[PDB]
Structure 1
Amino acid sequence: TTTVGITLKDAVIMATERRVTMENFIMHKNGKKLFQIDTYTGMTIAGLVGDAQVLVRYMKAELELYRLQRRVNMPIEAVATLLSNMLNQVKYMPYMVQLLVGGIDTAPHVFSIDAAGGSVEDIYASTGSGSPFVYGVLESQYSEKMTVDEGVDLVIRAISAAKQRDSASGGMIDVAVITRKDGYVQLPTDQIESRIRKLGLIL
């Protein structure tokens, strides 16, 4: 699996691929690994599929409830804190996952949460078997000054690089952009395919 989240001035961009394996066996070419969990909040999942899927349902439910109760969206750091508590509480019978939570409150944020509930905020982050390849691309190419269009191309390049070198990564790249102005927008596949072409990449 490869997932990525980056922050820009007033934007978060999150992306994943879609390959689901049982060891070397590619069972599903089109799994979903990127989810809207609130108005301005997205999450990516890596690790054990059943565990990650249960947490997505739990987060969608809880953030909806919290929103109705508080009349405002859960702050992104509060999302990461809740997950942190939840995952640490079962650390000896854990959810075997790596999570990125990304969103906009008064500012853009990306958090990376591990299976023991350790949560760290970063300007960008990547999870899954493909993440080392992504971190190479981002280290070399990320700039805090990038436009959303440049950041979208960046995550596409990073995940395409990971697909070339991680056999557990593959399939169509899914991308969402989160802004205060436009909310959570999943980019249409046709748009991502177009950028893949114009960048000289494959799939």
Structure 2
Amino acid sequence: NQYDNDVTVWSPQGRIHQIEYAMEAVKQGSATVGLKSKTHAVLVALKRAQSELAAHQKKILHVDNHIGISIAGLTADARLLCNFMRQECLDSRFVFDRPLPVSRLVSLIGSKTQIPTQRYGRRPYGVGLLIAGYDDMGPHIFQTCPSANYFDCRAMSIGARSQSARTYLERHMSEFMECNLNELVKHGLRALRETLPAEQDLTTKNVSIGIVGKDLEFTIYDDDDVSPFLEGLEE
């Protein structure tokens, strides 16, 4: 019981409990998915409603023209990382005058989220992320964690009950490469419904998406622009 309260205290098993508890913060929030073809990379985030009267949180944030993120975790805590990511992408266009490589941008997050896990008296950022981007090496989908360990992934799902959405992405993995703009998005939309119970369906209000690709900059479709993709998909 004494090993729990501090970040810098190990255990007899070599497990840091606070970093484990910070992983629970990701499971406490809405599920998000994303995947990439040979060209496009699309994030699909489920905007959760506090009530039917109140509106929905924004789970997708712009970073740079070619880069976008889907935040799952503490909402105001993700705006600390998003503000860091926007400054790194501006400093890349201000200095090198080139779009920042996505594999570099995720490495800077691994350096920023590593420090609070190392030092006493601080907490690890409780936000998981999916960074979708496009660069000279092709589209990328990167998962991060509170533990600061970042991955390189074809498709992932984070958030509450994300394991089921991950299972769906594995079966269709072979088809993800040749999908066009429309069909690619439909793969992610079919993943979200698996996370939520059948008593709730997908609507124009509670689902937001973003798309980055070869000739297309990262753009967020809010509500009315989500409907044309929602239509044509059987539930």
With the length of structure 2 as denominator, give the TM-score of the two structures.
Answer: 0.75
Contact 1:18 1:29 in 2 (8 A): no
Deviations 1:118-160 (A, max 9, x none): 0110111111114222112212334222222111111111112
Q: What is the CA distance between 1:26 and its match in structure 2?
A: 8.5
The secondary structure found in structure 2 opposite 1:80 is helix
Paired position in structure 1 for 2:132 = 102
Paired position in structure 2 for 1:147 = 180
Root-mean-square deviation (CA), in Å? 2.5
The secondary structure found in structure 1 opposite 2:44 is strand
2:138 is equivalent to residue 112 of structure 1: no
Hey, what's the Cα distance between the residues in 2 that align with 1:166 and 1:55? 34
2:135 aligned partner, one-letter code: D
Q: What is the CA distance between 1:27 and its match in structure 2?
A: 9.3
The secondary structure found in structure 2 opposite 1:150 is helix
Paired position in structure 1 for 2:95 = 69
Hey, what's the Cα distance between the residues in 2 that align with 1:189 and 1:155? 17
Q: What is the CA distance between 1:73 and its match in structure 2?
A: 1.7
Q: Which runs of 5+ in 2 are unaligned?
A: 1-29
Q: What is the CA distance between 1:188 and its match in structure 2?
A: 5.2
The secondary structure found in structure 2 opposite 1:159 is helix
Paired position in structure 2 for 1:193 = 227
Paired position in structure 1 for 2:211 = 177
Paired position in structure 1 for 2:36 = 7
Q: What is the CA distance between 1:166 and its match in structure 2?
A: 11
Q: 1:20 to 1:83 in 2, by over 3 A?
A: farther
Paired position in structure 2 for 1:49 = 75
Q: Which runs of 5+ in 1 are unaligned?
A: none
Hey, what's the Cα distance between the residues in 2 that align with 1:187 and 1:164? 24
Contact 1:133 1:165 in 2 (8 A): no
The secondary structure found in structure 2 opposite 1:174 is strand
2:60 aligned partner, one-letter code: L
Contact 1:40 1:183 in 2 (8 A): yes
Structure with bigger gyration radius:
2
Hey, what's the Cα distance between the residues in 2 that align with 1:27 and 1:51? 25
Contact 1:130 1:166 in 2 (8 A): no
Hey, what's the Cα distance between the residues in 2 that align with 1:8 and 1:70? 28
Q: What is the CA distance between 1:110 and its match in structure 2?
A: 0.8
Contact 1:159 1:173 in 2 (8 A): no
Hey, what's the Cα distance between the residues in 1 that align with 2:231 and 2:37? 24
* Residue correspondences, number: 197
Hey, what's the Cα distance between the residues in 2 that align with 1:166 and 1:123? 30
Q: 1:95 to 1:165 in 2, by over 3 A?
A: farther
Q: Percent identity?
A: 21
With the length of structure 1 as denominator, give the TM-score of the two structures.
Answer: 0.86
Q: Which has the higher strand share?
A: 1
2:40 aligned partner, one-letter code: A
Q: What is the CA distance between 1:89 and its match in structure 2?
A: 0.9
Q: Which of structure 1's runs of 4+ aligned residues deviate more than 6 A? A: none
